[PDB]
Subunit: 221 residues, 4 copies
């Protein structure tokens, strides 16, 4: 029995059928935004969602059976179990059920290759991320103390300062929307932001080049 | 006769004459925006367009003759045939007739080299493009469900959500124009967009570095 | 006595205790933005700041003792001494005391590695920075003379021209916010800014690629 | 006499004295924006400008003497002669006299190295620039025909369309400022701009990577 059930679970066709269920359910989720289409086929849509979630849950049961230790030590099946379990509980969280469509990435081998390649790079940049978060923390405290009183919408609390600094980093309306109105009152805020812009852009560039060399040295040898 | 006609078609000078026709027709298309110049020489312009399209169509006939199987299996001549045929039909589509100027790229060898080099890179990034389209699909459904009611202009339907997410990806007015007005009502939309910005920017950077390594390894060996 | 005191200063645990003091003081600085929390525990916060600054100052004394010549010839301890001394003087400068949190970078070995790696790149780009500053100087003088009278907010003095040019370089509202309102009066300002944008973007790209090759050649050999 | 005059012109100190004149004249040009400083020392400033331009012109005469054929076949001295001659003619052109400060780049060896390195890259990208200019031409004609009537400020003539397309390429207010107001009337303009944005960004990325490989292969061998 274990032989038959594992030869079914690890068979190509079981994964293919759940892929087709994933694709049809993704189209289903894409169609429920329409008020008109919901009015047309609410009952059919809900029925389809019930049957596909039943098949996905029984699939998760079979998979957690065939590999019990491996299921909770494999991030892909961990993610599948988490998304299925989240989709299971009814009432808010309805929005996060759309993350089940990421299971299309779980099933497809090429998408899995891409995502593993993407994840393997973070170990090379955790350090720079930590430095950047500390630098953001420091300059956000400075911005809140300096401009929080006169411009509470942008720096009144620490969080809005973190937000404004992330925005200035992105270089989106940093001068016209933030710095120039600050200079309308605090005429020497550029001593804060021009060094901030220089520093944060410089660090982002260095992060990119470090990523380049780490992804290239695995090929140069 | 086949000898003479192919020695004329594949001759340097036939392609050169059609190049000069392409250049003169490009100037012609560049001049028809002027209301004043149209008033001045409408009849001369229309006459020139008729004669050049006749020469281009007879050229396409001769080329489709000398290489019949090759014509429909060669993307350059496929594009030339398509643009000439589109320009042929009269009445809207008048705007797309300007794409005939891309035939200057078809004729010139260096432009052909550049375009082939550009196309040869997409096989290395189709996977990342597919992942990005799926990710855009998922977060666009989420954005439509969350913000479609209170901000229908940006997320009322799925398409406007795809548009707003592409824009936020470009980092054009993502905070002042979208996120901050959302926080005016939904105070916790940054939990959606800050991860979205981080993720989408990160994926774009990885796409660029993968393109770099694929275009460099063809030289390192 | 010198043996014991240096075996204490260069011991792992003294640096670890000052790290924990750094972290607790960073949380403390992060909490003083709250008007509510200040009202709650002003006396406790001030007491903690006094005791931690006393420990940091005695630490700086011990370190400047164990290595006197090295202290003023080591940029890390130079920075630590500078930030501690700045934090020492009471009354403005209260904002700059937050830079003591950068001492977390001083203590942590990995952060030190990152920062040294970042600094080692500037010798490869001082030349390009000098050229860019000269180019900014020249075009800022030009912008002040041309547009300073009709648009004094952006080019009335040299400094506001430097600012506007840095902004245009960043590509933030360069056309809608600057160039188009200029063309509302000076219709041929794009002859100034389009070459400026082309040139400044081109130089920034070349700076990035030069940084790439300098950081890669240290690995290729 | 030729021996003495060339040993003076090509001597280190003649170039150093003209460098000091360049630096002092650059400060002079930097000070004339001030209405107050002009009121203070107009006569002194004009006198200094007269004497430095006399020394620069006699220097250009001596240099064009020592190397007559080389002077008009050397781009650096060509630029020096051009800027000095432009500065010579009085009356508009007063703004372009500031380009004499680029002669600081001419004199300094390191700046010359940087600029030659920058120029040596364009031969590798003239082709891509030509393709991009043709693509801009085509889509600008399309934009003028489509949106010139309803939005003449952005596409009424060909030039304003070239400008708007360059701006959209830069990704500055492309959606909120251009595309969305167009969709207020022409609801299907994104079929024009989303492909335009994709294409133009993609080509710019490929230009950058080609520059990288051309500047790296000169080192890999
Ligand atoms: C990943 C590649 C495929 C991506 C496809 C994206 C397609 C986007 C289409 C957007 C269409 C919007 C234009 C439109 O008018 O569509 C109408 C429907 C619903 O109309 P609606 O606005 O609800 O009408 C209400 C009228 N009222 C208030 C008076 C009662 O508007 C909608 O609700 C959207 C239509 C749903 C399309 C679903 C496409 C599923 C693709 C599956 C791919 C996997
Ligand atoms: C470890 C690997 C993955 C790392 C990816 C993430 C790295 C950054 C982690 C940041 C940790 C700190 C998060 C944080 O401080 O968030 C604070 C704000 C909260 O805003 P909040 O005050 O809640 O606004 C609501 C106002 N309310 C309550 C009255 C309604 O929320 C924000 O505004 C967040 C904005 C972005 C913060 C940027 C922090 C530094 C990012 C550096 C990343 C690398 C850049 C090259
Ligand atoms: C690829 C490199 C070459 C690129 C060249 C780009 C040249 C752009 C020129 C833009 C000039 C706009 C300034 C201007 O005032 O031009 C006037 C003409 C037409 O005037 P228009 O605005 O129609 O006058 C109407 C007056 N009204 C309403 C009272 C009856 O405005 C126009 O219609 C535009 C003039 C057409 C220039 C065509 C240049 C062809 C270059 C061919 C390269 C291949
Ligand atoms: C004006 C807007 C776009 C209008 C339609 C665009 C499509 C038509 C353009 C045709 C242009 C000519 C195509 C072409 O040159 O293809 C050659 C490339 C490069 O060759 P290469 O990789 O050197 O040769 C490999 C062949 N091998 C392995 C047997 C030695 O070999 C390949 O083609 C590799 C396959 C890549 C296919 C991906 C092409 C997708 C283009 C879609 C453009 C949509 C724009 C939004
Ligand atoms: C295969 C090789 C070449 C690949 C290049 C293209 C890759 C992306 C394909 C996207 C396929 C899905 C297209 C799509 O969903 O378009 C939906 C919207 C339509 O807006 P729509 O709802 O029609 O607005 C009109 C409103 N109405 C009807 C009432 C007047 O139209 C849009 O808003 C389109 C906006 C861009 C969509 C971005 C989708 C993901 C792009 C990821 C590309 C890589 C990024 C690094
Ligand atoms: C580096 C990773 C950790 C980053 C953590 C970032 C946390 C940001 C939290 C922002 C929270 C803002 C939302 C909020 O309502 O917070 C309330 C407090 C103070 O309230 P407040 O606005 O002063 O109330 C005044 C009311 N009034 C005028 C009527 C008297 O608002 C505040 O003052 C901010 C709360 C302080 C949080 C400190 C977190 C320390 C993390 C240490 C990490 C090292
Ligand atoms: C918070 C805002 C900034 C506050 C002030 C910033 C300045 C103080 C920061 C001190 C941090 C520690 C400095 C440091 O680690 O320098 C080490 C680097 C890298 O060493 P490395 O290149 O590995 O060693 C080469 C030595 N050799 C050839 C004999 C083997 O060796 C070098 O230093 C090479 C020389 C480069 C000097 C350029 C540094 C300019 C920094 C200016 C920052 C201004 C921000 C706007
Ligand atoms: C050496 C290694 C590290 C190098 C990093 C820094 C490199 C740039 C150094 C710039 C030196 C010149 C600084 C400068 O000219 O600042 C002038 C403006 C001052 O504005 P200001 O006139 O005080 O405005 C206040 C108005 N008021 C007095 C009536 C209230 O202040 C500003 O607006 C500054 C804006 C940025 C200036 C950009 C100058 C060229 C930067 C090129 C950097 C590389 C780019 C790829
Ligand atoms: C390359 C690195 C060095 C870069 C240095 C950049 C320095 C920028 C300084 C900007 C200062 C602006 C603040 C300020 O209030 O300055 C006053 C002067 C002129 O005042 P002004 O606005 O003419 O007063 C008119 C008053 N009114 C209408 C009632 C008669 O405002 C000015 O005209 C500007 C002052 C000229 C500074 C020249 C610095 C030369 C550096 C040479 C480097 C080579
Ligand atoms: C060869 C090596 C160096 C190459 C660098 C330059 C490459 C681009 C050359 C462009 C040649 C065509 C220039 C052109 O068409 O300019 C037309 C517009 C003129 O605006 P205009 O109609 O005069 O506006 C005034 C209105 N009026 C008369 C009534 C007052 O003037 C503009 O709007 C210019 C805006 C930029 C045009 C962008 C053309 C394609 C650039 C592609 C560069 C590479 C991008 C990756
Ligand atoms: C990459 C390791 C793998 C790798 O690719 N190395 C090759 C060089 C890159 C680097 C980059 C970020 C580094 C961590 C951070 O600093 C924080 C932390 C500092 C403490 O001291 C304890 C160690 C920690 C966990 C570090 C471990 C390790 O050092 C990491 C993961
Ligand atoms: C490049 C191949 C050529 C190349 O340069 N390879 C070297 C590595 C890059 C990669 C990148 C994108 C890949 C496709 C996508 O995943 C979708 C799809 C998944 C299914 O399973 C069926 C295969 C498909 C068509 C894939 C084939 C192939 O795998 C592609 C073209
Ligand atoms: C890097 C040197 C180390 C290095 O990595 N070299 C390898 C090539 C890069 C380059 C880049 C910037 C260069 C300086 C500037 O031009 C200004 C100045 C010009 C004068 O003449 C006097 C010398 C100065 C100080 C230059 C020295 C040296 O030339 C520097 C530091
Ligand atoms: C670089 C040459 C030097 C180099 O680095 N080559 C190595 C490969 C890059 C390339 C890039 C741009 C190329 C020109 C353009 O296409 C326009 C033109 C096409 C006509 O047919 C006549 C030749 C022209 C002048 C081309 C010559 C040459 O082909 C150029 C300069
Ligand atoms: Na912007
Ligand atoms: Na931008």
């Amino acid at each position: 029995m274990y032989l038959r059930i594992t030869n079914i679970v690890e068979s190509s066709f079981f994964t293919k059928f759940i892929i087709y269920l994933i694709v049809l359910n993704g189209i289903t989720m894409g169609l429920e935004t329409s008020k008109t289409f919901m009015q047309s086929f609410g009952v059919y849509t809900t029925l389809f969602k019930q049957i596909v979630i039943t098949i996905f849950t029984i699939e998760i049961i079979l998979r957690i059976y065939v590999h019990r230790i491996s299921f909770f030590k494999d991030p892909w099946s961990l993610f599948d179990f988490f998304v299925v379990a989240i989709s299971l509980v009814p009432t808010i969280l309805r929005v996060l059920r759309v993350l089940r469509l990421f299971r299309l990435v779980t099933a497809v081998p090429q998408m899995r290759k891409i995502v593993s390649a993407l994840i393997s790079v973070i170990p090379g940049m955790l350090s720079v991320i930590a430095l950047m978060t500390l630098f953001f923390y420091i300059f956000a405290i400075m911005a809140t103390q300096l401009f929080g009183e006169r411009f509470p919408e942008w720096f009144g609390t620490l969080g809005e300062s973190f937000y404004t600094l992330f925005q200035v980093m992105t270089g989106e309306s940093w001068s016209m929307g933030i710095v120039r109105p600050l200079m309308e009152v605090y005429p020497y805020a550029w001593v804060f932001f021009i060094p901030f812009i220089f520093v944060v852009t410089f660090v982002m560039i260095n992060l990119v080049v470090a990523i380049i060399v780490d992804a290239m040295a695995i090929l140069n040898q």
